Amino acid sequence: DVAGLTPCSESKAYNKLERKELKTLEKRLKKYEPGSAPYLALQATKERTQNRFKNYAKAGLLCGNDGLPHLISDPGLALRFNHAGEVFIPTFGFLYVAGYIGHVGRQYIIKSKEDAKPTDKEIILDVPLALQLAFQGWAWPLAAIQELRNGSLLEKDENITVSPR
Amino acid sequence: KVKIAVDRNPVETNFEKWAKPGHFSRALAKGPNTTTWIWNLHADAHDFDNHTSDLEEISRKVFSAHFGQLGIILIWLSGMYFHGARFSNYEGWLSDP
Amino acid sequence: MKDFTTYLSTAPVVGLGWAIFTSGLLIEINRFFPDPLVFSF
Amino acid sequence: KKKEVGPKRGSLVKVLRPESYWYNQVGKVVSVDQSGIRYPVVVRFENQNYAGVSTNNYALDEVTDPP
């Protein structure tokens, strides 16, 4: 009940929107015979809509004055009202995946530079090496913070290409 | 005077030139060093007048490219006919257009 | 074989392979989990 | 003359010229001129500049070791 908003199950506009969607799906369904493929397609669409509306309810989602669910982004407030699974857990998961991408790209950049014509390896990818680095990135934060600890993650300002002042 | 003039097997069907992206021009044959090379790979692909100065090779490339475009067009037409055959209501449309 | 493999090892081909792989993974996830919005186990 | 006016040929050098494209970059010494020109150190670089060239002439005071 934060931000002056009501839960989706307790709200009336949420149920009104669900009823309107079911009504227009039934209006589209009534134009087809029950023994036709569009009838089964529309029945599956209605079942998916009902399942989605049931899953959005009883999951902590809340909507304000329009029946459209709202998401709470501040940690702590989302922790004490069971809204962490809205954005807090997905943002951590996306950070994990983005760090996976960055670590894999960094490993491929570093590991394909101690050879003749590194641009050729950049343009024609070493597929077994790329797959090996792909399956070795599951521990990206450990290796990242260890490279930070030993100083190989960052380059010194003496070996870095720099623009004139 | 007018007769068929054809050379037999001037180019061997090998994948050795598929590995090298920049091969049609000597400027791109040295390999890439900047990203503007890559666009130059996709810009001078059909610039057959710049790859070679021989008109015969350019004409052969033009003939092959026209055959490829006709094949692409026929693929698109066959796909259109297939979509009309299966994922369509043409039979229903014929009853009441 | 190895020339065709190096052609398949070129950047657009492996990018295409990644594109089909990621698109198919996300599409199958959306199909077998129809329209989720909030992580609720 | 005695020894050589510049560094050993084929050795890596770091360019200290601020206006150069290869400032704080590692290049290879091709040849060092001994006549007494202003920029005798010919350095070849692995990465080309915007003009597409990869070699430049630098003086003795703008080259150091690769750190």
Added chain:
Amino acid sequence: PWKQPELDPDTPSPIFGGSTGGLLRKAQVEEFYVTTWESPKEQIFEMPTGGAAIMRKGPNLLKFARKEQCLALTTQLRTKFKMTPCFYRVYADGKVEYLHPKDGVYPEKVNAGRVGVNQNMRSIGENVDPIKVKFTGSQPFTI
């Protein structure tokens, strides 16, 4: 070269029709440029002011309104037929100035007879900042 040649207006022009991108009123108000060459035979060349002309076996004289057109024709004749032409500049009052072969050996050579001017003896990037030269009328590159 050893002696600066003098232009001859009576030299025959190359065989050509009418040009549209030819000399404008600036030719009779300001200076205009005139290119001379020595063709050993008759051949077809492309003018920078239009289509194509045919040069005569002998001296050939052409008129232009821009020095860039004269040097473009000069380098076309040098690259295509190795002609080595030369163009003068004629003002409204009739003053004739020798322009391209200043020492007669072309600027690609040295000839050990030209004094280098407008040459800064410091390296580029060693010039002073514009704050150093302020309210003086002197640019940082002009010192």
Added chain:
Amino acid sequence: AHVVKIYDTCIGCTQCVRACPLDVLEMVPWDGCKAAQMASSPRTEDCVGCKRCETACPTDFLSVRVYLGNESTRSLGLAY
């Protein structure tokens, strides 16, 4: 007209003079380079500022520099 300035980093490769479409540069004898040549601009009043000489310079940065300003009839490339 425009200002053409040539520094001591020039190697006397004569590329700027060949790239010049108005015959502004020249080669003078020199002792500061291996080729014993130095670029000069004795005809800077005819330069239009096309910067074609800067494209042909092989040295890093530029051994020849063109600065625009105070355009005239010759500097504006006008046939009229």
